[PDB]
Amino acid sequence: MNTVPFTSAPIEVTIGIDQYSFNVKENQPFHGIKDIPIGHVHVIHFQHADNSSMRYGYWFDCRMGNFYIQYDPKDGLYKMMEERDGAKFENIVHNFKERQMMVSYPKIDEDDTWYNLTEFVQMDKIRKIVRKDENQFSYVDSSMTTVQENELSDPAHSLNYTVINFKSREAIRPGHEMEDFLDKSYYLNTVMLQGIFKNSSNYFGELQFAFLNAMFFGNYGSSLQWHAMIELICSSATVPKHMLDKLDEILYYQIKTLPEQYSDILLNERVWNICLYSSFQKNSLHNTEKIMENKYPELL
Amino acid sequence: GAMNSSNYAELFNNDIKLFVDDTNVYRVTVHKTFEGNVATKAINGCIFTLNPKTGHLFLKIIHTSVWAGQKRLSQLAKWKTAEEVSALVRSLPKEEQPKQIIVTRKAMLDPLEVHMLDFPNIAIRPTELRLPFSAAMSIDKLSDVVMKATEPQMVLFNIYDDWLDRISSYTAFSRLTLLLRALKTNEESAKMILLSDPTITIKSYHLWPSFTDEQWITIESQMRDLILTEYGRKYNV
Numbered sequence: 087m088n089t090v091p092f093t094s095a096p097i098e099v100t101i102g103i104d105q106y107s108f109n110v111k112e113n114q115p116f117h118g119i120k121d122i123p124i125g126h127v128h129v130i131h132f133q134h135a136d137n138s139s140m141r142y143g144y145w146f147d148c149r150m151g152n153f154y155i156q157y158d159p160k161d162g163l164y165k166m167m168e169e170r171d172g173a174k175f176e177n178i179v180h181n182f183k184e185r186q187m188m189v190s191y192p193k194i195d196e197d198d199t200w201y202n203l204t205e206f207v208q209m210d211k212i213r214k215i216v217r218k219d220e221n222q223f224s225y226v227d228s229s230m231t232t233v234q235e236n237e238l239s240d241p242a243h244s245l246n247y248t249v250i251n252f253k254s255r256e257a258i259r260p261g262h263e264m265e266d267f268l269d270k271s272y273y274l275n276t277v278m279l280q281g282i283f284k285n286s287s288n289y290f291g292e293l294q295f296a297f298l299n300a301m302f303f304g305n306y307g308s309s310l311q312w313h314a315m316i317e318l319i320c321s322s323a324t325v326p327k328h329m330l331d332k333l334d335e336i337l338y339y340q341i342k343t344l345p346e347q348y349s350d351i352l353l354n355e356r357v358w359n360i361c362l363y364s365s366f367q368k369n370s371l372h373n374t375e376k377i378m379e380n381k382y383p384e385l386l
Numbered sequence: 387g388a389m390n391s392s393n394y395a396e397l398f399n400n401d402i403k404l405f406v407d408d409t410n411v412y413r414v415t416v417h418k419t420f421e422g423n424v425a426t427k428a429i430n431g432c433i434f435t436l437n438p439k440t441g442h443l444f445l446k447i448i449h450t451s452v453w454a455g456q457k458r459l460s461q462l463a464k465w466k467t468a469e470e471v472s473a474l475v476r477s478l479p480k481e482e483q484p485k486q487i488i489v490t491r492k493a494m495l496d497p498l499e500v501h502m503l504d505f506p507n508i509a510i511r512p513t514e515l516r517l518p519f520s521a522a523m524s525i526d527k528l529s530d531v532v533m534k535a536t537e538p539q540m541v542l543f544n545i546y547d548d549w550l551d552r553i554s555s556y557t558a559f560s561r562l563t564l565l566l567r568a569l570k571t572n573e574e575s576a577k578m579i580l581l582s583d584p585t586i587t588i589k590s591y592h593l594w595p596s597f598t599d600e601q602w603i604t605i606e607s608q609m610r611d612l613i614l615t616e617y618g619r620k621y622n623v
């Protein structure tokens with residue numbers, strides 16, 4: 087179990103750790119989060135009491151170094167930073183624990199939610215989408231645009247997502263126009279899964295990464311990306327049975343975890359009614375369809 | 387974006403554009419079978435590709451053989467249209483290729499757009515107008531070449547005959563839509579009106595009668611009356 091210490095908490099802020107969050111008051115004596123399960127990727131995220139504009143946060147994997155948070159009063163945000171002096175880090179941590187100023191990552195043992203939302207999230211790939219090679223952790227916020235939002239303007243602060251475009255020569259073989267536009271299996275199976283992702287677990291990884299960025303930061307371009315990666319499967323007649331089953335599990339937990347109140351901006355009616363009722367896979371997402379019908383029947 | 391009465395005059399500027407109407411691409415007669423069930427039989431059809439500035443009509447005729455062994459023909463038809471228009475554009479010298487293609491029906495946009503990916507600079511646009519191009523098969527010499535074709539076949543017409551010698555493209559387009567609208571609402575009367583006086587002929591190389599300027603005014607008025615009339619007879623006013 088690892089620890090993400092905080093130098094201090096000078097401004098009132100809502101802190102999030104994965105799917106948990108708690109309120110910290112302006113100069114309440116807070117010194118970080120303990121008992122974080124190793125073996126998964128994590129996200130620690132912020133929303134200032136004063137300016138609910140800008141949710142922002144850091145993807146990190148504890149196995150890749152010792153990370154802490156320190157507020158920067160020039161840039162006005164809680165920054166993630168790496169400690170290379172290992173003994174200085176174990177020492178700082180131990181003192182804050184002994185004085186019990188850290189909240190505990192509060193995992194119920196029955197609960198697999200986090201694993202189920204992050205099974206395919208890879209931290210080293212995350213770095214090659216949120217490009218910033220001098221940090222082992224990755225910053226995202228609400229307002230970061232994607233590479234494809236920028237094709238339609240600062241490239242260092244972009245989300246380099248896997249560009250999907252259904253009216254593109256990538257997607258449409260010459261002479262197979264009608265066929266490839268109505269059944270995208272060639273774009274999915276050969277172009278993307280065989281030529282770009284390498285395998286489906288990678289396809290699921292970016293798809294999972296997109297959703298979480300959407301959910302945790304209200305990042306609109308990540309929402310677009312999540313729906314497109316879904317649309318591409320739902321619009322393909324030939325999908326490996328095992329991908330379909332995992333996708334049904336993947337979405338089920340995404341829909342389970344979505345706030346009941348954010349559905350109107352984070353769910354795309356067109357894409358879902360296609361997956362669930364119109365498209366090739368209308369009969370292939372039983373778990374996802376049941377939860378969507380019982381939780382958000384208004385959308386459909 | 388889309389085309390309506392407000393940007394109506396753009397049609398007659400000097401950027402090359404074509405209208406595509408796919409209404410008459412897939413045509414069927416519906417009949418009963420010996421077992422008393424219903425079946426369709428396809429008949430030849432056509433794509434109606436028109437340059438409104440010049441009058442040039444690229445009539446691509448769609449022989450029934452193109453449907454043999456195909457399923458979901460109404461949807462195929464839209465893609466078949468898109469293939470043929472793309473093929474048409476590719477066959478044109480660059481300076482003859484259009485800068486816009488306006489589809490008469492919104493369902494054609496994706497099929498054409500997908501077929502035109504190689505031409506990113508050619509705008510594919512819908513329109514809000516209720517243009518009467520489906521009545522083009524009420525034009526005897528068009529209906530004839532379509533029904534007689536034995537193979538796919540492209541045939542070039544000028545749908546304005548020699549009108550541009552005496553009037554503008556704007557007026558020529560207005561006459562054509564008036565004629566076609568009349569033909570669409572009451573083919574029989576529309577045609578009686580055009581051909582009553584056997585002393586006005588249709589030259590072998592034209593589609594419409596050789597009316598004088600004054601005779602065209604009388605024609606145009608009678609076609610208006612017909613369209614109003616038929617609108618009364620239809621709405622009882």
Ligand SMILES: COCCNC(=O)C1C=C[C@H]2NCSC2=C1
Nearest residue numbers: 207208211212283288291292295
């Ligand atoms: C650079 O590769 C383009 C295809 N994407 C991947 O391989 C990813 C795998 C897992 C991911 N987890 C998080 S983000 C991500 C991307």
